[PDB]
Write a protein that binds this ligand. Sequence first.
Ligand SMILES: Cc1nc(N)ccc1Br
Length: 167
Amino acid sequence: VNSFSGYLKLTDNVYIKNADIVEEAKKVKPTVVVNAANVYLKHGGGVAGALNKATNNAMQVESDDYIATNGPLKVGGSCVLSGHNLAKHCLHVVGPNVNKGEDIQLLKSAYENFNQHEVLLAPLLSAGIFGADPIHSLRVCVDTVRTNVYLAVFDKNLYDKLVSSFL
Ligand SMILES: Cc1nc(N)ccc1Br
Protein backbone atom coordinates (compact mmCIF):
# COMPACT_ATOMS: atom_id res chain seq x y z
CA VAL A 1 0.00 0.00 0.00
CA ASN A 2 1.15 3.64 -0.63
CA SER A 3 -0.07 7.26 0.09
CA PHE A 4 -1.18 8.19 -3.47
CA SER A 5 -4.94 9.06 -3.51
CA GLY A 6 -7.58 9.69 -6.23
CA TYR A 7 -5.66 8.12 -9.15
CA LEU A 8 -7.23 6.29 -12.13
CA LYS A 9 -5.55 2.88 -12.65
CA LEU A 10 -4.55 2.54 -16.34
CA THR A 11 -2.49 -0.67 -16.11
CA ASP A 12 -0.88 -3.03 -13.59
CA ASN A 13 1.74 -0.32 -12.81
CA VAL A 14 0.59 3.06 -14.24
CA TYR A 15 -1.83 5.41 -12.50
CA ILE A 16 -3.01 8.91 -13.54
CA LYS A 17 -4.63 11.94 -11.88
CA ASN A 18 -5.57 15.56 -12.78
CA ALA A 19 -3.26 17.42 -10.37
CA ASP A 20 -0.76 20.33 -9.85
CA ILE A 21 2.54 18.34 -9.43
CA VAL A 22 3.97 20.86 -6.88
CA GLU A 23 0.78 20.41 -4.77
CA GLU A 24 0.82 16.56 -5.09
CA ALA A 25 4.51 16.34 -4.09
CA LYS A 26 3.91 18.68 -1.11
CA LYS A 27 1.03 16.41 0.10
CA VAL A 28 2.57 12.93 -0.53
CA LYS A 29 6.33 13.63 -0.01
CA PRO A 30 7.08 10.74 -2.37
CA THR A 31 10.46 8.99 -2.35
CA VAL A 32 10.93 10.22 -5.98
CA VAL A 33 9.41 13.15 -7.88
CA VAL A 34 10.39 13.36 -11.56
CA ASN A 35 11.34 16.72 -13.07
CA ALA A 36 10.86 17.51 -16.76
CA ALA A 37 14.43 18.71 -17.03
CA ASN A 38 16.62 20.00 -19.85
CA VAL A 39 20.28 19.01 -20.33
CA TYR A 40 21.49 22.22 -18.59
CA LEU A 41 19.14 21.74 -15.58
CA LYS A 42 17.90 25.29 -16.22
CA HIS A 43 14.52 25.16 -14.49
CA GLY A 44 13.14 28.45 -15.94
CA GLY A 45 9.61 27.51 -16.92
CA GLY A 46 7.39 24.42 -17.38
CA VAL A 47 7.27 21.57 -14.79
CA ALA A 48 10.96 22.29 -13.97
CA GLY A 49 10.24 25.98 -13.27
CA ALA A 50 7.16 25.16 -11.15
CA LEU A 51 9.09 22.59 -9.05
CA ASN A 52 12.07 24.90 -8.70
CA LYS A 53 9.87 27.84 -7.59
CA ALA A 54 8.31 25.59 -4.89
CA THR A 55 11.87 24.91 -3.54
CA ASN A 56 12.56 28.69 -3.30
CA ASN A 57 15.27 28.22 -6.01
CA ALA A 58 17.21 25.64 -3.93
CA MET A 59 16.72 23.11 -6.79
CA GLN A 60 18.41 25.56 -9.23
CA VAL A 61 21.31 26.25 -6.82
CA GLU A 62 21.94 22.50 -6.40
CA SER A 63 21.55 21.95 -10.16
CA ASP A 64 24.08 24.66 -11.06
CA ASP A 65 26.67 22.98 -8.82
CA TYR A 66 25.84 19.59 -10.48
CA ILE A 67 26.39 21.01 -13.98
CA ALA A 68 29.57 22.87 -12.98
CA THR A 69 31.00 19.50 -11.81
CA ASN A 70 29.56 17.03 -14.36
CA GLY A 71 28.57 18.98 -17.47
CA PRO A 72 25.22 18.67 -19.21
CA LEU A 73 22.98 15.61 -19.21
CA LYS A 74 22.19 13.69 -22.41
CA VAL A 75 18.77 13.96 -24.06
CA GLY A 76 17.11 10.74 -22.80
CA GLY A 77 19.27 10.77 -19.65
CA SER A 78 18.77 11.64 -16.01
CA CYS A 79 20.37 12.39 -12.67
CA VAL A 80 19.22 11.96 -9.10
CA LEU A 81 19.40 15.08 -6.91
CA SER A 82 17.68 16.21 -3.74
CA GLY A 83 13.90 16.46 -3.57
CA HIS A 84 14.23 19.44 -1.22
CA ASN A 85 10.86 20.16 0.45
CA LEU A 86 8.94 18.18 -2.19
CA ALA A 87 10.25 14.58 -2.04
CA LYS A 88 13.22 12.58 -0.79
CA HIS A 89 14.81 12.66 -4.26
CA CYS A 90 14.21 14.42 -7.57
CA LEU A 91 14.90 12.37 -10.68
CA HIS A 92 15.69 14.99 -13.34
CA VAL A 93 14.81 13.32 -16.67
CA VAL A 94 15.45 14.90 -20.09
CA GLY A 95 12.83 14.03 -22.62
CA PRO A 96 13.34 15.26 -26.19
CA ASN A 97 12.12 18.81 -26.80
CA VAL A 98 10.26 18.86 -30.17
CA ASN A 99 10.47 22.76 -30.11
CA LYS A 100 14.34 22.23 -30.36
CA GLY A 101 14.10 19.45 -33.08
CA GLU A 102 15.18 16.42 -30.88
CA ASP A 103 14.48 12.77 -31.92
CA ILE A 104 11.11 11.66 -30.42
CA GLN A 105 12.52 8.02 -30.39
CA LEU A 106 14.56 9.35 -27.41
CA LEU A 107 11.33 9.48 -25.40
CA LYS A 108 11.52 5.71 -24.74
CA SER A 109 15.12 6.09 -23.48
CA ALA A 110 13.94 8.94 -21.18
CA TYR A 111 11.18 6.78 -19.64
CA GLU A 112 13.64 3.87 -19.13
CA ASN A 113 15.20 5.97 -16.32
CA PHE A 114 12.01 5.47 -14.30
CA ASN A 115 12.71 1.70 -14.10
CA GLN A 116 15.59 2.39 -11.66
CA HIS A 117 13.01 3.50 -9.02
CA GLU A 118 10.30 1.30 -7.51
CA VAL A 119 7.71 4.12 -7.16
CA LEU A 120 7.63 7.63 -8.71
CA LEU A 121 5.43 10.70 -8.96
CA ALA A 122 5.94 12.06 -12.51
CA PRO A 123 4.68 14.29 -15.30
CA LEU A 124 4.27 13.08 -18.84
CA LEU A 125 7.72 13.41 -20.42
CA SER A 126 8.12 15.70 -23.42
CA ALA A 127 4.55 17.07 -22.92
CA GLY A 128 3.64 20.71 -22.31
CA ILE A 129 6.30 23.16 -23.49
CA PHE A 130 8.52 20.26 -24.74
CA GLY A 131 6.11 20.02 -27.68
CA ALA A 132 5.33 16.27 -27.94
CA ASP A 133 1.84 14.79 -28.22
CA PRO A 134 0.86 13.86 -24.62
CA ILE A 135 -1.22 10.89 -25.90
CA HIS A 136 1.98 9.52 -27.42
CA SER A 137 3.94 10.24 -24.22
CA LEU A 138 1.38 8.25 -22.17
CA ARG A 139 1.57 5.30 -24.61
CA VAL A 140 5.41 5.25 -24.41
CA CYS A 141 5.20 5.48 -20.61
CA VAL A 142 2.84 2.48 -20.38
CA ASP A 143 4.91 0.45 -22.82
CA THR A 144 8.31 1.30 -21.20
CA VAL A 145 7.94 1.82 -17.43
CA ARG A 146 7.61 -1.40 -15.41
CA THR A 147 7.87 0.23 -11.95
CA ASN A 148 4.93 1.94 -10.29
CA VAL A 149 4.35 5.40 -11.74
CA TYR A 150 1.80 7.97 -10.56
CA LEU A 151 1.29 10.52 -13.35
CA ALA A 152 0.11 14.06 -12.55
CA VAL A 153 -1.49 15.89 -15.52
CA PHE A 154 -1.86 19.68 -14.82
CA ASP A 155 -4.57 20.35 -17.49
CA LYS A 156 -8.10 18.98 -16.67
CA ASN A 157 -9.06 19.11 -20.34
CA LEU A 158 -5.96 17.10 -21.33
CA TYR A 159 -6.45 14.65 -18.42
CA ASP A 160 -9.96 13.83 -19.65
CA LYS A 161 -8.71 13.42 -23.21
CA LEU A 162 -5.83 11.08 -22.09
CA VAL A 163 -8.26 8.86 -20.11
CA SER A 164 -10.99 8.79 -22.79
CA SER A 165 -8.50 7.93 -25.59
CA PHE A 166 -6.44 5.37 -23.60
CA LEU A 167 -6.24 1.93 -25.21
C1 LIG B 1 2.59 25.84 -12.49
C2 LIG B 1 2.98 24.72 -13.45
N1 LIG B 1 3.38 25.02 -14.67
C3 LIG B 1 3.72 24.09 -15.52
N2 LIG B 1 4.17 24.44 -16.85
C4 LIG B 1 3.65 22.76 -15.18
C5 LIG B 1 3.27 22.40 -13.91
C6 LIG B 1 2.91 23.40 -13.03
BR1 LIG B 1 2.36 22.90 -11.25
